[PDB]
Every structure is written in C-alpha cells, then in structure tokens.
Design a protein around this ligand. Structure first.
Ligand SMILES: Nc1ncnc2c1ncn2[C@@H]1O[C@@H]2COP(=O)(O)O[C@H]2[C@H]1O
Ligand SMILES: O=c1[nH]cnc2c1ncn2[C@@H]1O[C@H](CO)[C@@H](O)[C@H]1O
Length: 274
C-alpha cells in the first residue's frame, strides 16, 4: 500500500477537476485523503462508447479495469435480462476487481453515447480498495436487518456499506447537536438514544426514543435545514454513519420511505417546526 507507484496519464486540469467531483460522490473512494484522490485521478483515463456497445461481458476473465461514468447510461444484464440501470457517476466493473472473479454481468450502453473514466486493477486494489471487503462484510449482516433499508436490493446494501463508518458513544454523549449542520445519518446497531428538541420558549423537550435498527439525522438531509434536535446516547451505543455527500448515491431507493417516516405521528414535533 505504501510503495505502489500509480501510473500518471496525461489530462487537463479541467479533466482532473471533473474527475475529483466524481470520486467525491462515488462510494468506492469514500475514505481516501486528498493525496490518494489526486493520485487515483492521475491514474485514470477517459473512454467513450456508443449505444449498444458492451463495455464488458458476463463471464469475461480479462478484468483489468473499472469505469466511472461521466455521461450517459448502461444496462446491467444477467442471464439475458436487464436487472439494473447504471447512471452518471456510478461505477461498472468494480466487482471483478474486488473479488478477482469473472465479470458478473454484461454492461451495455443504452444512451447514444457513454463517456466514462477508467481505472486499472492494480491502482484500485492497491490505492483504493483498502478494507472495502472487510467493511462490506462487517456491515451487511446488520444491514439486511435494518427495516428502512429493505428497499435497497442486495447490490445496493453492499454499496451503502462502502460509505459507512462506525462509532461508539457513551451514555450522555451527543451524537447530533441541536442547531448545527446535519452532516451524518446514523444507523443504530446497539443501544438507545433520545431525541431532544426545543419548544417555542426554548426549553429542552423530549421527543422520542430510538433503538437498534433505527435511523437519525436524515431529516436535515431531506429538507435542508439546521438540526432540529439533539440526539443523546441513553445507553452505550454503536452506530454506522453515512455522510451527506453519499446520501442520494446510497439511499435513493428508500428516500421516499424516509419522507413517509417523517410524516408519522412520532414526528409530530418535527411537523410543527414548519
Ligand atoms: N445486481 C447488480 N446490480 C448492479 N450492478 C451490477 C449487478 N451485478 C453486476 N453489476 C455490475 O456489472 C458489472 C459487471 O462486471 P463486474 O462483475 O466486474 O462488476 C459488475 C457491476 O459493476
Ligand atoms: O419530531 C421528531 N420525531 C422523531 N425524530 C426526530 C424528530 N425531530 C428530529 N428527530 C431526529 O433528530 C434528528 C436531529 O434533528 C433528526 O434528523 C431526526 O433523526
């Protein structure tokens, strides 16, 4: 991990800046610092495809690159059926580079053009991958039991795991602080928490108690406002958190469920804050 020298491929400073924006939202790069992000972007090169081009084909064994889509879209096709639609900013060909397997599916361009940014297997495995498989596999056992994640398919739960990181809190620790910017959605894996808002007069007000499998922090993501309450650990608590920049990338399919949840009777407090 230390002595690996990535290739550098010629590109303009505009292309590098465009790449960095992509790496910012795609979860494969969630935990890279500035320098490794700069080096990963140096190690990438632009490719182009036409409609119906197969960027890769199920069962192939030369698998020495993944791609990050800048523009256009691609179908993911297993056993002849389209199973998944890959859109701008997402990755294709990452599974074979992570698990050293043949391509799990055909990837076929379904827009007139597709522009994507390619990355070789060695630079990914060495600079990017890190503990992604250990991280995926530690979280997935929990994730399949989180109720609001039921609308994420299996591929999407493992993708969310690429962007999660965990924390331990002690009784009385502030996980979320009232009036500050919401930056993390927390999934509770062990313990209990209190939601503490304020009334009109500004007094502390107990709102709700949440536990294992619950989620907090997403209200400020949905409707772009300051934290409406504290969230305080009642017990020794353990959480996985998702950064705001990965919110839509990872939770797109259950966003409508989070909005439904925010109109339930236990968000009456939050309801009257507008
Ligand atoms: N269920 C799936 N959902 C979304 N994308 C998939 C799925 N299966 C395969 N793919 C994508 O298709 C790619 C085909 O090659 P890879 O297996 O290297 O990496 C794969 C993923 O990028
Ligand atoms: O009325 C509420 N009911 C239930 N949970 C709430 C309510 N208001 C806020 N939170 C929780 O506390 C976080 C900090 O603002 C919110 O993002 C939400 O998860």
């Amino acid at each position: 991990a230390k002595s690996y020298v990535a290739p550098y491929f010629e590109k303009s400073e505009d292309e590098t800046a465009l790449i960095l924006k992509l790496l910012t939202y795609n979860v494969l790069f969630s935990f890279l610092d500035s320098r490794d992000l700069m080096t990963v972007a140096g190690a990438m090169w632009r490719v182009e495809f036409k409609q119906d081009d197969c960027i890769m084909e199920a069962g192939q064994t030369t698998c020495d690159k993944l791609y990050i889509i800048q523009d256009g879209k691609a179908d993911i096709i297993k056993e002849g059926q389209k199973v998944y639609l890959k859109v701008e900013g997402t990755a294709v060909g990452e599974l074979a580079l992570m698990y050293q397997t043949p391509r799990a599916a055909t990837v076929k361009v379904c827009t007139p053009e597709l522009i994507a940014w390619a990355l070789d297997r060695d630079t990914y495995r060495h600079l990017v991958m890190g503990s992604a498989i250990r991280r995926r596999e530690t979280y997935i056992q929990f994730l399949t039991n989180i109720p609001f994640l039921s609308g994420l398919d299996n591929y999407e739960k493992l993708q969310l795991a690429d962007a999660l990181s965990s924390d331990e809190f002690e009784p009385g620790d502030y996980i979320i602080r009232y009036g500050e910017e919401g930056e993390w959605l927390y999934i509770i894996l062990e313990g209990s928490v209190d939601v503490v808002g304020r009334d009109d007069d500004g007094n502390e007000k107990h709102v709700w108690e949440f536990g294992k499998g619950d989620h907090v922090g997403e209200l400020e993501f949905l409707n772009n406002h300051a934290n409406v309450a504290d969230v305080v650990a009642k017990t020794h608590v353990v959480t996985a958190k998702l950064n705001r920049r990965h919110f839509e990338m990872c939770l797109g399919p259950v966003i409508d469920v989070l909005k439904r949840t925010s109109q339930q009777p236990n968000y009456e407090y939050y309801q009257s804050k507008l």
